[PDB]
Amino acid sequence: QCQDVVQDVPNVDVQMLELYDRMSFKDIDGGVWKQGWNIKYDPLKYNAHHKLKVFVVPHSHNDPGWIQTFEEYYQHDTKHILSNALRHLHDNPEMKFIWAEISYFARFYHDLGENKKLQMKSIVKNGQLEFVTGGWVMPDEANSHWRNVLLQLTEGQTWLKQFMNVTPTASWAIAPFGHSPTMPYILQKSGFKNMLIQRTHYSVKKELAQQRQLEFLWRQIWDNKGDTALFTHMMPFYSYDIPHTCGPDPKVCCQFDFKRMGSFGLSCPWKVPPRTISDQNVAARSDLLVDQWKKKAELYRTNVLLIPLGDDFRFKQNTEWDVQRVNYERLFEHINSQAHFNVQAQFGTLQEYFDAVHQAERAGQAEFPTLSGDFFTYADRSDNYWSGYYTSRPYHKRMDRVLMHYVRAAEMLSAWHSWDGMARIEERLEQARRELSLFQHHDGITGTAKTHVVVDYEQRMQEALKACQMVMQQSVYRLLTKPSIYSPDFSFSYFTLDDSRWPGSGVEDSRTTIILGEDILPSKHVVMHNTLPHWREQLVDFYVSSPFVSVTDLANNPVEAQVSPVWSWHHDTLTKTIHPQGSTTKYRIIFKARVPPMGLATYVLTISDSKPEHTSYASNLLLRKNPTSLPLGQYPEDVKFGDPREISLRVGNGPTLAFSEQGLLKSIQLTQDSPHVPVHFKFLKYGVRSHGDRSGAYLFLPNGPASPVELGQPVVLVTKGKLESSVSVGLPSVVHQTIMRGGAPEIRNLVDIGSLDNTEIVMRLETHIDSGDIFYTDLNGLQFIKRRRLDKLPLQANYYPIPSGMFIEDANTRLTLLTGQPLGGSSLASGELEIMQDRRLASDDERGLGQGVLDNKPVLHIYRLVLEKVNNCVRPSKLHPAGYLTSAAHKASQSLLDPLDKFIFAENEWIGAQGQFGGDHPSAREDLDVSVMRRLTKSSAKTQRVGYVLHRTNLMQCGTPEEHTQKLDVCHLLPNVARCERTTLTFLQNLEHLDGMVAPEVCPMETAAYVSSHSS
């Protein structure tokens, strides 16, 4: 019995969209608490029978890359922090410390001798050192895909379970730039009971503090019942540093950061230094500190107070451990002995804080409010909204999504078999998982690291892509070769991957041409993989050395194909134009591949001396004044030329698209009879302020609304084919392409911002749709949340992450834009959508990076554009905070994020080749995905185990029957099943032993994990 995620509006105490509509967002000087007020407390609130219990929680924020690389920080800082934590905690049994980033901890632990490993395990087992979250990193929450948030969580927690025998149930996220409800969603399904966040808008902190709503049960926006709820603590102040964690007055709190007295090269900007605690000052010092604590305690509902004690890369030097510990010990001894304070203070861990809060709750001392919504877009002060990092370093944002899919496909393809250790499958997959996991860091995918650190992340991800390719192609060879013939060399390349959209045409010449010829090689096998659990057809393309190529399946059935030229665009420094050149040596062949659920399909490409019966050739039309010829080698159809003009295209029975004379979409007509709906693409530019605060990697501070890019008279190329047509235009900084294959168009932008300093390029869609001030954007590729433009906030506050899509709608019409990469975007006026393409910024934005963004490189952004009639759809009510995709939009998103994978057989002949794998796999209902398939055991395990993460989205009911699908039971995908268990999403805890060894399908918007055990 599934909860209805559409028709029941949850009743919550705080709903963030509603809160935003009501709040004034005034930025007034609140006094010492600059963004709050002067807190008052009744000194008689605490007495002998009701004391304030204070947990001082030492911590050290360690960025896995930011200003230095991961390895540089490890050598210079983190290895010392961890080595000294081990010594100091061992020697001081009441001292405590929390640790978040398992990438660093694993890097350290594996370099320890056994003696030290044992000492480390002992300070963990006794609770002095406590892991918080236990992910590989502390991830970004804006740009990250939920699948990769889960991947990195699993990587860190699997390491902790194996080596430390612990699994954290409290999360610590002090640093991501705004916070997403995807986090409690994943954490609550991974055994967590509590979480902590910090970087929320200063106005939200003030509002919630006033109502004592900084601790709340955070549920998903659609969750009527509350089963997704996770207890959440929001910190109240401007920073997680010591000046902003003891209480509301940083001039006072800074005096209790004992690293700031001078010899460490640190000081207090409020001009009052810390003083060493002595018997002659401890009473006065304690009075000041307890004062701060009791003020902070006024903001919360229990008598249990959390005081973080730390900052970036703290607790390095032995002298620093001593100075913080000894001074706090003197304070605690005094405070705890002086009845008049009515305080019991101690070093603690995060879990100890939460346990004590919940003890107070059970004692009936507090009830907590319920909350739904998100915490974007963050501003830390004034109008400094952190919407710039939704776009910064977009090449690597796109690379994240490519590697996301590669990791899934490599793990899935190799899961079907057990592999010998010599095959190095587990080794390559662990490397790939860890490099993608590292990049989820809040200075990785966010694009907020120094140039050489971005380079490090890129090199790591490139190695991870090669690892995935190796595992994938070994797996394909095994799955599709007759078993008695299969003779693997585990170092050999049986196949190479062919990827048409990464790095992309015009980004890198990386694609191999299939070289055929009468005097060399008549034919070539290619294989497609489909990681999705339903049959899929999709056009696929390969480069070939002749236009006279035909396609067959492995039963030798002809397959209809289309050949087109290979076009590349060149900024001609002679003529000062951007125009295409066609290859005279290679050609593109395109055909529909039909591939089983989670399966493989083989095809053959064969050369002939002349036009094959089942291959057609696209026409090509170059629109420009003053054309010159465009020879195409053997290509059988001459290029046509014309002056710029409006054009219309229709592929199959799909929509008819009309384009301006500048090659940009102007309208879509869904069906023969239907209207030509205005849908206009436009490119614009934002600039930077010449006075006041400057945009940088983090902040978007535009100097007003965007101005149209001056287009001149651009060259437009039209390719018209039976299977695929396109319009491409060379605009300043963007080669913009609209591709039609018979359904929703695909948009590709090759974006090269070149040397345009202090410029952000935006792609806008203008329509008639009466959306008003409402639009929808996704959170981590998991859910769509309703946004409301607010004219009381500046432009940059109305920008939100677009990690996978966005839409606007009215009563009748919806326009959805799906993305293959996370970027920033908004709807700044009724009927508009816009999404930032790249940004190049000369200035630092005072958040610690110490550089602008001047390392741009060409990137190929990909999208799908879905215009739909929605008046017949069953949509949520006007008060519901969520929205949901249609079937077509969801499929278009899957097309972008998890396309078919293409393999080209490397050798001349593939002996023992088979035509298909997975023809007997169940074809599951369209809303269900097998997000993860991963074998969990190495070959020496008697009982093999395979883990599956199943996710069911929720698609709108719009009157399409779309029926008959097969039940997917992941537990019977592999033979000889002996047991099936439901587990946490990390696979680390068994939750239910399943009857009949059958894994049930999940409810809409739910994600479940299962592990099947096999005795073979």
Ligand SMILES: CO[C@H]1O[C@H](CO)[C@@H](O)[C@H](S[C@H]2O[C@H](CO)[C@@H](O)[C@H](O)[C@@H]2O)[C@@H]1O
């Ligand atoms: C201006 O911020 C600098 O000082 C504060 C202390 O109040 C530090 O928190 C940060 S470093 C911190 O935040 C940046 C974004 O500002 C992030 O990129 C890093 O990962 C860190 O988490 C600054 O040094």
Ligand SMILES: *[C@@H]1O[C@H](CO)[C@@H](O)[C@H](O)[C@H]1NC(C)=O
């Ligand atoms: C892992 O933790 C639990 C703690 O109760 C314990 O039963 C188990 O023995 C531990 N495993 C060890 C210490 O190897």
Ligand SMILES: [Zn+2]
């Ligand atoms: Zn950080």
